[PDB]
Design a protein around this nucleic acid. Sequence first.
RNA 1: GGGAACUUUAAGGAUACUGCCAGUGACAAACUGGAGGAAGGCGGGGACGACGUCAAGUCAUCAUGGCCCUUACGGCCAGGGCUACACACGUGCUACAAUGGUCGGUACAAAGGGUUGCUACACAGCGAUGUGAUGCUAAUCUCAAAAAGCCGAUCGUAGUCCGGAUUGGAGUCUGCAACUCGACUCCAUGAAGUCGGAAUCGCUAGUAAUCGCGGAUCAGAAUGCCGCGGUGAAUACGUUCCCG
Lengths: 100, 115, 82, 126, 136, 100
Amino acid sequence: NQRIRIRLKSFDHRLIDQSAQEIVETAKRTGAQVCGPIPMPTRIERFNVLTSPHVNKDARDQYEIRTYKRLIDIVQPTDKTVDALMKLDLAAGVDVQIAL
Amino acid sequence: ARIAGVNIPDNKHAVISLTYIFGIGRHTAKNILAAVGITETTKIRELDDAQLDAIRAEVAKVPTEGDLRREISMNIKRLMDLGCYRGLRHRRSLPVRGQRTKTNARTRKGPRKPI
Amino acid sequence: PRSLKKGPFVDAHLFAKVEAAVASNSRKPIKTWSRRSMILPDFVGLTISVHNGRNHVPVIVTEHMVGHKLGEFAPTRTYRGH
Amino acid sequence: TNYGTGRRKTATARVFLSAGTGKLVINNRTLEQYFGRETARMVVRQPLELLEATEKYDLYITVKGGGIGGQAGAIRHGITRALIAADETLKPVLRQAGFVTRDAREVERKKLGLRKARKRPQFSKR
Amino acid sequence: PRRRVVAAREILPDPKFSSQTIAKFMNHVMQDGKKSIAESIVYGALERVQEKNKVDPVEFFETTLEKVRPMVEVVPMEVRPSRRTALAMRWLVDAAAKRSEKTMALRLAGELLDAAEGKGAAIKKREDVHRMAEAN
Amino acid sequence: AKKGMINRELKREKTVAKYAAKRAELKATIANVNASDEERFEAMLKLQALPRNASPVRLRNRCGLTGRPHGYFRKFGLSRNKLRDTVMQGDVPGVVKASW
RNA sequence: GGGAACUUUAAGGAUACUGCCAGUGACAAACUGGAGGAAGGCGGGGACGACGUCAAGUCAUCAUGGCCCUUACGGCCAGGGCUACACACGUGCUACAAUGGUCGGUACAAAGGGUUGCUACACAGCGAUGUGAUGCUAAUCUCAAAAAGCCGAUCGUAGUCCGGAUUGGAGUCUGCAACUCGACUCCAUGAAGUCGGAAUCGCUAGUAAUCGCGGAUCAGAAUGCCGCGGUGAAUACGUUCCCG
């Protein structure tokens, strides 16, 4: 009863789905059943920044940043699956957490 | 009736009528009524003389009118004589608890005095 | 006000001075800048020169003053009228 | 048997329609228990009273989100969609009554420099 | 506006009587979005008038509305029909507000019955409009 | 800001970091129920006898580039002027103009 | 247990284009009415601000020409001040009550924050809070009680069971430290205020009005600012005058 949990975090959804698709494709090639990827709710943070150097309270820029999360489950893992997962490259801008 | 030297309203509930006495609020009235077992919705006009005497006995336990006013006056006079910061504010008839005075001190300063 | 579980607050350098005076009996005013120190029962009968931002004003401690801050008897602003 | 989904002001209602006596439960509660005000109860019942079919169907309803008015509107929309799914010939009558339209009105966001969506702070020439 | 003609906003019929007149009266009564309170006030008065004379609530209300309806404003000119009804409801709510009774519903029913016999501040204001129209 | 103010901030940070451990020890000893009232009392006296700059409440957040003491935005560590400039140049990952 | 139906979560797509019918305008650009459709003529909102004007604002974010100080106009420290108070003005909050106040019971959200943090539950306290303890690096645990709403009782038009300023007395918490000068809790007190002149402001639909909820800054300290949802109106004949 060994299950592998993969969590992906990023600031760029196109990157995060590219990485998730690559991981899923590799796992399917190795010969293990996978579940996902499952999109978790996105986090959004906003800021209001005054633009003028001295006094204009109504002159502000509104910025935002988003955090995207993906969840992937691997069930019935073959022996080659794990070593393939550490052989898999790490792309900048996407953070990966693996739990056994 | 007359309680503690005060004519409380006759056609009101007891818990509301007892608040007409200085030094007694809603919480104190509730506590007094619960200590003599009279329902809060009963008006004082359907109260027996014995119940009124019991209420008078309960009321005398707390400071109500003359002692309370005397003690407040003494407390203020002590500060004014000692000359601390609060005493000076009491002397000048200005806000005492750190409020702004550039505007909005009308309760302590009375109506506006033209220049 | 300061929580009762912590006790009153007195500056150590002022506490040492008053304790030394009371162990002795010197009537010399104690010069201090500690407007925030609490007046204790040991303070009664002493003269303390409290700073008020510009000068040191003398205060003679009586029984009625116990429980107050030293700064309440040294006003910092000057006002006489408009 | 038939299914419908209704939406109104962030409220979503799932409606399951069958044939029966007329039982109606919302979130394991009766209509009068769930809705306190009469107009909310009337809005829910409007489609069946219009069709004169108050007695031939049984309803199983769940609903989440929004307030009482939004939830009543969502339930009405879901019932209308369930009836349409059950019989396509009923669509002209319900569309004429106006029940098939999804009301897209929604709360407008607060805007920078304003107290509300449109309200502006008080201003003075003087 | 200046260039366009904006269509009037159609209001839904009252879900209990299917009466746009009753719905408009409820909207006139309602304050700051409290529709339930206005519904209770209006329905209570409609039931009260029904008991104090056994008449249909809708018909009795339309007849009283037509009685308290003006005919002219103020420069004399003929008031369009919608403004007539809008002005009659305002008078009927304003005058009903000033009576002395336990609830707004009872005051509304009482002055509806009073106006049904032509006795009320709304009808008096109507006669005032008649007089000042005779003035012009 | 001025070099004197920046150096003051640096000195206060150094003092806080130096005295961090003993302050926590004394606070734990004060909070200790099992310890004697006397132990807690001398613990409190020692805490009051610690230097003033050891207290974290005297630290003020300043911009990491200019030293400005207003508009800090803990997340980026920069004041509003530098945050605006750098975000609009594109050197902050993930931050974009916000519209909704 | 189980299921992959539904809601939702979130990536990619489809759809709306005067497409169809009728009348008009020139016979064009267009315009008016109807069907279908979730939506019909720009469906709603946001960001994006041409050539230029104001010697407009900022040498105190920063950079920079020139001028000035160099045992001081530089640097360090403790205490005080920026919180003053006969007055005038701007922007707000809370009220003057019955479409309401209080008490008991009982429903329905969205968005956002949490490891120097948020805390289930138990005990102690009238209460702010304290102690023990549990889960959470979070669609998993938590802040968290939504409030207006509905049902029942009571108050009966009174400066009141409206209002909640001011002051007296007890406390809690953050912090080395709440005197000048913090927030909150309890007992007592119970001010003006009866809908406000000349004049003047905002708003055309999920808008105005009203009700609550969250965050940045931040040891502590919002009636301000930036967001979120609940309930939900009235009126537009027209350009004769006011402003641009």
